[PDB]
């Protein structure tokens, strides 16, 4: 479903609204036709991926737009400067979104997007693959759906039935996978295989990919809302952001890879722990010290790594270490700043801004 996919050269033959493709796929699925339903569902998946990829490309130029220095008189009016920058950014976004092919079709409704983010089409996909003699693809789709919903009894029954068949035991693959997860898995395997340089290279390749994906996901959460109240200026633009923040809080936990059916808690801390151990085993402390400092930054209350840092600090005149190789890496500092700021803002907002006129039914 994703082998013949290219963001730049997308075949113009299948460019249709996402909702229409999904509707045709479901209609043919209910009509006891399998192959055509499979094709239409795959086309809908490709269209959703193209829409996300296009939305994550028009937020690259606009955010990274160094503003020109304004006149001397404008510096005394901060509100005008802030909102003029906002108008310029909105203009850049509007101009950029008119050149992409995925934004010139009928955009889908919010409920369809919510259903697609919940991995609902994969149930139909796995059943249709089963009814068309595609057992490996069927089990792959079932596993992909199970990755997001770990509490679906029907999926457990279907997957257990799939395991019962012979041969279908090594085709368990994730259809919706990311590069950084594969790099992390390869690095973990290499580290367990007492190989250090390969593990270091793989982890150092995996970190920027995770940060890029995290910031793209954060940028993709600033969407429209449903108008149901008519308040003043600040009181109304401080509720759109409350919904946006409710969406943003879960981006960190929606990106963590799952291994063995359990998500790897403290992903970035685990990354830096592995990097620190690997770097120390090579006696290259110039790079080992900042990794330890970053791991302290993410997990303050440790015991063994604090005594490690004591050893590095007290014996700084043994290998050669300046006063600069004792501070966290800039990317870790930025990640910590963003996560802590978002959590603090949500904690503040859910005491003074959020309305209290709903309760719990007993």
């Amino acid at each position: 479903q994703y082998e013949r996919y290219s963001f730049r050269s997308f075949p113009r033959d299948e460019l249709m609204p996402l909702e229409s493709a999904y509707r045709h796929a479901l209609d043919k699925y209910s009509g006891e036709h399998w192959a055509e339903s499979v094709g239409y569902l795959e086309i809908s998946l490709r269209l959703h991926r193209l829409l996300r990829d296009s939305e994550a490309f028009c937020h690259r130029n606009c955010s990274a737009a160094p503003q020109p220095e304004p006149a001397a008189g404008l510096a005394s009016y901060p509100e005008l400067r802030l909102f003029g920058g906002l108008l310029r950014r909105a203009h850049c976004l509007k101009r950029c979104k008119q050149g992409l092919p995925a934004f010139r079709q009928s955009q889908p409704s919010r409920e369809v997007l919510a259903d697609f983010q919940r991995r609902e089409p994969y149930k139909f996909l796995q059943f249709a693959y089963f009814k068309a003699n595609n057992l490996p693809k069927a089990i792959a789709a079932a596993h992909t759906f199970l990755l997001k919903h770990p509490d679906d009894e029907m999926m457990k029954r279907n997957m257990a039935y799939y395991k019962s068949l012979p041969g279908a035991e090594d085709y368990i693959k994730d259809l919706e996978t990311k590069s950084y997860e594969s790099l992390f898995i390869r690095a973990v395997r290499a580290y367990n295989g007492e190989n250090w340089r390969t593990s270091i290279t793989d982890m150092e390749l995996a970190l920027p990919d995770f940060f890029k994906a995290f910031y793209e996901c954060l940028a993709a959460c600033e969407g429209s809302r449903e108008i149901k109240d008519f308040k003043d200026f600040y009181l109304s633009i401080a509720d759109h952001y409350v919904e946006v923040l409710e969406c943003k809080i879960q981006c960190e936990e929606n990106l963590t890879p799952v291994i063995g059916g359990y998500p790897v808690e403290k992903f970035v801390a685990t990354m830096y722990h592995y990097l620190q151990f690997a770097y120390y085993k090579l006696n290259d402390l110039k790079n080992a010290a900042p990794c330890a400092v970053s791991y302290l930054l993410f997990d303050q209350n440790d015991k063994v790594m604090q005594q490690n840092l004591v050893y590095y600090q007290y014996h700084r005149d043994t290998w050669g270490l300046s006063d600069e190789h004792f501070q966290p890496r800039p990317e870790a500092v930025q990640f910590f700043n963003v996560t802590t700021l978002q959590k603090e803002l949500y904690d503040f907002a859910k005491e003074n801004i959020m309305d209290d006129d709903e309760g719990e039914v007993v």
Binding site: K228, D357, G359, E360
Partner: protein, 181 residues
């Protein structure tokens, strides 16, 4: 989760010359005020005019029952306590199913004194009418009036009269569910 009720007003219906029962409403005086305050004021008759001896002039089967027009019987009158019309406050709640009360309007920002009790899930009215209540008790009585013989103009052949209408205080606001009935 669901909205919190704060007041309860009760009616006493009468088709022809036979008692039928009693319908008790539950009004959300915190989600949408200034619309409950209109309904409560007309129910108890603080300012003289009220819902006493009113009539239901639309008994459309399987859709809704509409009433509350006390100025004239044809269903083209009605005045509130805030002058004549007042604007829509907020569309926070939807017509989730049977037994949900809302304000009937003849345009935009023309809320008067006419309401209707929904009987089937009307998802196409969402965002146009303002919902301010829910039928708590007597859901079997509202279905008695709906199955009465009606002419082409949807006016019931036998008159429906609100004999009594009052107000019950609520000592502790309790939430309800957004399901039905």
């Amino acid at each position: 989760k669901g909205p919190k009720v704060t007041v309860k007003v009760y009616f006493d219906l009468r088709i022809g010359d036979e008692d039928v029962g009693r319908v008790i409403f539950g009004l959300f005086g915190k989600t949408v005020p200034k619309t409950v305050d209109n309904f409560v004021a007309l129910a108890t008759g603080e300012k003289g005019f009220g819902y006493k001896n009113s009539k239901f002039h639309r008994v459309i089967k399987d859709f809704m029952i509409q009433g509350g027009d006390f100025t004239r019987g044809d269903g083209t009158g009605g005045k509130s306590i805030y002058g004549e019309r007042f604007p829509d406050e907020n569309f926070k709640l939807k017509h989730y199913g049977p037994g949900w009360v809302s304000m009937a309007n003849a345009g935009k920002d023309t809320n008067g004194s006419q309401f209707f009790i929904t009987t089937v899930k009307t998802a196409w009215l969402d965002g146009k009418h303002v919902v301010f209540g829910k039928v708590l008790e007597g859901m079997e009585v509202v279905r008695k009036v709906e199955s009465t013989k009606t002419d082409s103009r949807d006016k019931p052949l036998k008159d429906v009269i609100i004999a009594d209408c009052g107000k019950i205080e609520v000592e502790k606001p309790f939430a309800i569910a957004k399901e039905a009935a």
